[PDB]
Symmetry: D2
Subunit: 220 residues, 4 copies
């Protein structure tokens, strides 16, 4: 399965896809009592739909992703309501020692009082302390669902995300953009790469006509 | 895959595409416990479990695309299911074909009518024909299609694509594969159920057994 | 508040939750010049979720063909009059001759109008005959034309209502639903003048609300 | 109406559109008569005709710990606006369970010590957070060390149908105790503004176990 590594331990992996660029063409064409034509006319229809704001045809393309991301990223991500999610449960599972530790380069462009290496160090220290406490509470008989509340927001979680191309393009608009947090931008770049490989005509037409973000026009 | 079931006199339900299968639900559900697939026994059991306890979100990862040909009055009820995606034939843009649902005499079974059921059938096809011929005359006269079509009756056939996940599809079946629904949409719901059963047999069997609220599938 | 649309149609406001300050409170997560400024700011920058906390209920009487276009807006709630159960009323949208202005037609506009009324009358008379014969209503009604009036309750938040106005208060939309959209817009402006003003200025994608 | 929940939490009613009669008006499609209107409400609820209840809408203002909010926010048929850790300096407010939260569980240390241990890490994480901020580290990065029991605040706009689903699932002994407590608050307010719908819900549609016992 197409699998892209993000951050220090994160990833985005394509589990499944229904349909392709031509799923959008077939759906749009029914309006005119038509179906598919030639490659040239069909690709141009996709561009036509994107340039004029016909978004519903792209709902017939659907993806399922498997994502590992820090909780603070997942919290932003799961704000996208037009999608389906299933997530690893801190209530039911003993959580693994896996946390996002920013690299020193993460603080490029910020004048900092202490070296970036020290920032990285201080984050790690809280992480180890919290995790040790989490395991101590569990070992003492403290229910998992309570023990986990001391764990920090950089804890990695895992989830399945099923989402259609229209909602995926909203996601890219809002998250593949320099206003979203850098961490989620990185995940959105991987989503974009998988989308482009499966639906190249829709992706290129989106970038050309419909996409509102900045970064995907800059970064291949 | 590809499945097609003819419904009423001229209608159909055709499966255009599917994403996932019963194991798609098993995998999504198992992530909760930091697990994946296991054996057929334990995974079939899990699907029954999910269905018994009303854990419906794992089934959203199973997705269907249907191509449907149905009368407008059927489509009108169907399109009330908002948790799904639609694209439909446009009267504003297309010259509409002479295809209308004409009930068969048997459709009045159990109804004592003043005129022979065959006559009811006849009367329906007569009005449909008059309406259609008026539509064509207006079109030939240069009336925009979006206006001409307003004289067309509710038994005109339309066509649409429907993308829907297994959870919404189970909701559709609870409501439409039921005696209280109109017989015509029941028939479409029966075809949707047959296709669902074929592609997701474990989910369907568990649905019938533990969650399905209607009366016609059982 | 009620606006008559078409020959027999209308849009009336049944209820509303909130005003422009509802979006301001949601955006700030708490609880006059700076508050209007925040509304324009949110609108200019595409921050739409705060407008979801303003909600309207409309009662709408409209031809079925208009309602079918309308009910494609999935992010909203609907309850509609039942034709399976209710004997349906003799009310149909008959276009005025002026509806065909611009179109060079082989039949005079007034004659097209007349041809539509005729079908409506014959269709309704067939429906009534069937019901009289003991044909169930849910079957008898299938002969009724797409211009039959129906009524529905529509509950929709301001964000989805702005999406509706972007698509339907626009010259690409069918003229008949444009008229309805103009009415919805007028009510929206009454209740949420700051949001409506900023919407027009910064976010609205249609054309007719800039002209009318 | 504002109800305190947990140690620093609350559920506050901000607005409401409609009342029980809004569902009746929608069901009948008509812009009253108590017994026949209550009877309709019960009929709809009994036969699962739930769409008329979507025309009653609530706005709440809720203060809750992030681990509770993450569960809450899985309810997609609703609208949310939340205090932003990326843009605001976060307040020293964290949920620390009472010893009675863990009484019942046989634990190897006193519950009192479980409280102390939890409080200790909270305090350490918060201190590091403030240090990093003071150092010039972006808020968005500095906050990643804060634990899941940090309090957040959001506006929630939800219709009565979706709110009844939320009660089915959360006002229930399988939901985490913390979110149960919020659900009881939501239910009390819903009962106050929509008494006939709430009664009919309990009698016919409610699938949980706590609201019939409390
Ligand atoms: C840079 C940035 C900063 C942000 N800051 C904050 C913040 O400070 N606080 C905060 O709470 N959130 C914040 N968000 C989250 C934001 O408010 C949205 O919750 C999130 O981006 C999901 O957007 P969406 O509603 O467009 O997507 P979805 O929820 O997936 O919805 C997709 C589309 O369907 C529609 N839709 C779905 N449900 C509804 C509905 N109930 N009503 C009307 N339309 C609906 C809309 O058209 C929407 O575009 C931020 C997002 C970004 C990118
Ligand atoms: C005790 C308990 C344990 C849980 N454990 C986990 C877990 O381990 N992992 C995990 O990921 N989640 C878990 N959840 C969350 C659960 O999976 C749902 O996300 C949550 O209950 C919201 O439910 P909902 O979909 O009914 O509500 P909403 O998202 O508000 O949706 C409301 C209704 O609309 C429908 N609906 C909305 N969107 C769609 C859609 N895209 N497709 C089909 N139908 C739709 C359904 O009819 C649904 O009832 C748990 C919840 C409870 C109460
Ligand atoms: C026998 C029968 C008779 C009917 N008679 C009438 C009638 O007389 N008049 C009429 O108007 N309709 C009528 N309907 C339609 C009915 O009211 C629903 O519109 C239709 O059945 C769709 O059901 P749904 O809302 O559950 O499905 P969807 O709209 O697909 O929604 C699926 C699920 O998601 C949820 N959901 C989706 N959107 C929202 C939302 N905005 N708020 C809260 N929850 C949401 C609900 O949990 C719902 O079960 C009838 C249906 C049947 C089967
Ligand atoms: C001029 C014109 C011509 C049209 N022609 C046709 C035609 O020929 N055939 C046809 O079938 N329809 C046609 N439509 C209808 C159109 O495709 C939409 O169904 C309708 O405009 C509703 O728009 P919407 O989905 O944005 O609104 P809603 O359905 O209310 O949704 C609101 C927003 O939330 C989002 N959303 C809701 N559900 C989903 C979802 N399941 N997946 C992804 N995002 C979602 C999107 O952000 C959407 O903008 C036409 C509309 C217009 C204005
Ligand atoms: O009772 C529960 C358990 C889990 N989840 C959802 C919320 C999170 O998105 C994810 C894991 O939650 P926790 O188990 O970590 O609380 O699944 C809930 O919504 N309710
Ligand atoms: O069995 C039914 C009856 C009604 N409706 C909805 C669809 C329409 O929007 C409206 C009226 O439908 P008819 O009763 O006219 O079919 O209510 C259904 O979905 N199913
Ligand atoms: O302007 C339009 C054209 C089409 N449709 C949708 C509504 C119907 O579901 C279908 C066909 O509509 P008509 O063209 O026949 O109105 O496409 C709209 O919503 N608006
Ligand atoms: O860039 C952002 C900022 C905020 N939020 C949402 C997610 C949370 O529900 C809430 C606060 O997020 P934080 O700012 O704390 O990350 O707003 C986002 O979705 N994206």
């Amino acid at each position: 399965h197409m699998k892209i590594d993000i951050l220090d331990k994160g990833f985005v992996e394509l589990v499944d896809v229904m349909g392709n660029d031509l799923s959008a063409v077939r759906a749009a064409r029914v309006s005119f009592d038509m179906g598919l034509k030639d490659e040239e006319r069909d690709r141009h229809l996709i561009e036509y739909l994107m340039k004029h704001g016909h978004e519903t045809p792209f709902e017939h393309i659907v993806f399922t992703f498997h994502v590992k991301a820090p909780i603070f990223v997942a919290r932003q991500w799961f704000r996208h309501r037009i999608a389906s999610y299933n997530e690893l449960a801190g209530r039911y599972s003993k959580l693994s020692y896996e946390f996002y530790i920013p690299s020193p380069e993460r603080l490029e462009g910020y004048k900092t009082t202490i070296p970036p290496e020290r920032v990285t160090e201080k984050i790690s220290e809280i992480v180890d302390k919290a995790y040790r406490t989490y395991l101590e509470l569990i070992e003492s008989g403290v229910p998992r669902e309570v023990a986990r509340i001391v764990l920090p927001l950089n804890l990695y979680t895992r989830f399945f995300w099923t989402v259609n191309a229209r909602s995926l393009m909203n996601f890219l608009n809002l998250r593949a953009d320099s206003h979203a947090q850098w961490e989620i931008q990185q995940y959105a770049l991987a989503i974009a790469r998988i989308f482009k490989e499966k639906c190249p005509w829709t992706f290129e037409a989106f970038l050309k006509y419909a996409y509102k973000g900045d970064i995907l026009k800059e970064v291949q």
